[PDB]
Amino acid sequence: SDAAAKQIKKLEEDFDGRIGVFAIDTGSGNTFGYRSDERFPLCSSFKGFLAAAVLERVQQKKLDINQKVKYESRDLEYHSPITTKYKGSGMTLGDMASAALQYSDNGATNIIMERFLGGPEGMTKFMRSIGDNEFRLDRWALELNTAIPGDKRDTSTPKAVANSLNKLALGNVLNAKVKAIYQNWLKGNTTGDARIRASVPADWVVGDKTGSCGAYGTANDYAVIWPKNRAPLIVSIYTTRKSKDDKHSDKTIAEASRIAIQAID
Ligand SMILES: *C(=O)[C@@H]([C@@H]1NC(C(=O)[O-])=C(SC2Cn3cnc[n+]3C2)[C@@H]1C)[C@@H](C)O
Numbered sequence: 001s002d003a004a005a006k007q008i009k010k011l012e013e014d015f016d017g018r019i020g021v022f023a024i025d026t027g028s029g030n031t032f033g034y035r036s037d038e039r040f041p042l043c044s045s046f047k048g049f050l051a052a053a054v055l056e057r058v059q060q061k062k063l064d065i066n067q068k069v070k071y072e073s074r075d076l077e078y079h080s081p082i083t084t085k086y087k088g089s090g091m092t093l094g095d096m097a098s099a100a101l102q103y104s105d106n107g108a109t110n111i112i113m114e115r116f117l118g119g120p121e122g123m124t125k126f127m128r129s130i131g132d133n134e135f136r137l138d139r140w141a142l143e144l145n146t147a148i149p150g151d152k153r154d155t156s157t158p159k160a161v162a163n164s165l166n167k168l169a170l171g172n173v174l175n176a177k178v179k180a181i182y183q184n185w186l187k188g189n190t191t192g193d194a195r196i197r198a199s200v201p202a203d204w205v206v207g208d209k210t211g212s213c214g215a216y217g218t219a220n221d222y223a224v225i226w227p228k229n230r231a232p233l234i235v236s237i238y239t240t241r242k243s244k245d246d247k248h249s250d251k252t253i254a255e256a257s258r259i260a261i262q263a264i265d
């Protein structure tokens with residue numbers, strides 16, 4: 001079968017947009033990229049890094065994983081499936097951060113950015129602190145999802161996402177028990193079954209976080225993959241289209257992931 005360079009180019013032509021890819025075989029250090037340094041909108045995918053930042057703070061004894069977070073007076077954001085359920089009782093910080101990741105919960109994300117992580121600019125400073133110079137969060141969860149062509153707000157690159165996921169999930173930034181907790185959160189993500197997970201054999205373990213801006217066909221997924229009997233892989237796939245009414249494509253993301261996994265092997 002064809003080199004990845006040919007398959008990814010034809011896929012991108014079919015998709016009528018742009019596809020950005022970076023994948024890492026962590027057992028060799030081999031990498032595959034296409035548009036890997038190009039900015040793409042994060043959409044909700046930054047929430048998986050917000051969850052990791054909460055766990056970094058817990059490891060440092062800067063937050064309590066079990067502190068109760070109450071929000072009985074909040075007007076909860078659209079797409080807050082878990083915080084909606086707990087509005088009367090509150091949630092622990094850890095459970096709220098888990099929901100920000102696994103359900104893309106907007107209320108969980110914005111409450112944690114308002115109270116603990118210093119807003120979009122605080123989230124951005126956390127990413128700088130771990131050596132990610134590309135990520136930028138300019139707006140709040142939900143608010144950020146405009147995906148306008150040419151707009152640099154709320155972007156990163158496929159490579160910086162992959163490198164940051166590697167750092168956060170595989171033992172660089174998260175050093176204590178919180179590393180396994182973060183891996184568990186990623187593994188239980190609920191929104192990615194049609195994306196990178198669809199490209200991976202079922203007897204490999206995967207954790208991921210998605211994003212779907214809902215405009216300009218813009219959507220993404222990143223994943224840590226634990227194959228049987230080999231070191232982890234990291235896969236980061238980001239997409240855009242040029243007309244506001246274009247829809248995103250799960251099958252394009254899964255395909256780009258298949259191509260990337262073949263390339264790094
Ligand atoms: C984040 O990108 C988005 C929210 N997060 C997710 C998600 O990652 O599943 C949903 S996107 C929704 C529309 N769509 C297309 N394919 C899958 N999905 C799920 C919500 C809305 C922003 C708006 O917070």
Ligand SMILES: [Cl-]
Binds near residue numbers: 044140141
């Ligand atoms: Cl969002």
